[PDB]
């Protein structure tokens, strides 16, 4: 049996800039049951339908974003999350699953634990993971190691309050990729 429970039902989720990836080998997987969990606001599959998969490696990437950025987890998409935090390839074959987690990842006064990368020199390559914490240089002045005029820390907090609107509430995202190689299964 596949360990899909410890991906979707994990107590805590990673920040998007430091998104988690679980590898899936061996196992027997029921993707129709995953669809029929019926607790998902977003379940979009590209290149395959959920009723057809029932491979060598399956990758389950998980993280948390705000609602309006869930659309950025899609091939060919653009924006802060797609460019600086998590990028999907144009030829993506897999599924994107998202569910609202305002009950879990939000607290009165604001939950500032979830971070995203605000600034970067170039766009992320597909499936790239950047955890650098170097001060971004937005001007001619070399930042060295401090912030100030055109010198900023690269990570920002989401600030998840329970009374946020849907577009600004926490959403937990799991992305399934199906990598087949010249290998067993």
């Amino acid at each position, epitope marked *: 049996l596949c360990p899909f429970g410890e991906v979707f039902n994990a107590t805590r989720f990673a920040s998007v800039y430091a998104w988690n990836r679980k590898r899936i080998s061996n196992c027997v997987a029921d993707y129709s049951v995953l669809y029929n969990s019926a607790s998902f*606001s977003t379940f979009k599959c590209y290149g395959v339908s959920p009723t057809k998969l029932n491979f060598t490696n399956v990758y389950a990437d998980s993280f948390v974003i705000r*609602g*309006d*950025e*869930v*659309r950025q987890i899609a091939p060919g998409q653009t924006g802060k999350i797609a460019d600086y935090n998590y990028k999907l390839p144009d030829d993506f074959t897999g599924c994107v699953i998202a569910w*609202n987690s*305002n*009950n879990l990842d*939000s*607290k*009165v006064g604001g939950n500032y634990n979830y971070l995203y990368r605000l600034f970067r020199k170039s766009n992320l390559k597909p499936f790239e993971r950047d955890i650098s914490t170097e001060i971004y240089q937005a001007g001619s002045t070399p930042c060295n190691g401090v912030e100030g005029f055109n010198c900023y820390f690269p990570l920002q907090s989401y600030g998840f309050q*329970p*009374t*946020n*609107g*849907v*577009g*600004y*509430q926490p*959403y937990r995202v799991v992305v399934l990729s199906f990598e087949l190689l010249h290998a067993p299964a």
Partner: antibody
Amino acid sequence: DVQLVESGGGLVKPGGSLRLSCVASGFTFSNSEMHWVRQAPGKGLEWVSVISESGETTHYADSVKGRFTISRDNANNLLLLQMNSLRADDTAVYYCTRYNWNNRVYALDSWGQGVVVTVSS
Amino acid sequence: EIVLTQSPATLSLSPGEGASLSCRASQTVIGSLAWYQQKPGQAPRLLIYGASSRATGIPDRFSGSGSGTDFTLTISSLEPEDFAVYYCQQYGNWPLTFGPGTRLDIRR
């Protein structure tokens, strides 16, 4: 002055479709999260659906998910509810309403006049 | 799902008395608790948000209080226009839910 004016209700046979519309005026529509809330005759308020300010996030009640679609056109100050596969349960007055969190009013602030929807053969 | 129960279902009072209306959630309300008033044939009118914040223009004889799973709406001195139906509602948990409503009628 803040105003929400709804249109598009009427009679529909079971299994039919119906598109409700709400036009906003007197406030920044593009900065407003909106909801559809319905009330069956002689019953209480029941939440139907929500769409965020930009339109990129929507959520639905269980009984209408997959059958209804909420949408918005911020350029035309327009909010829409496309209802498909209607049944007798869906008979209700439908209200359009704003959730004014961006103005620190965390409740259904402004309401439309409501429009009747009857599903019957 | 946060089921909201309102007690009592009906309240018979004379004008000039006070009204106390109860809302109980089946689990903690972490978002906003709101109170609405509805008259026949009209849209609901927002009275209270955030369990205690009175909406703009609402007369100050309306107040709200509470937290967690228990909230009360208080009308200090009843006016004839106040006899209506009252709903509590929570925001923050999906689905958005309403109470079944408390009906306030004139006692005689």
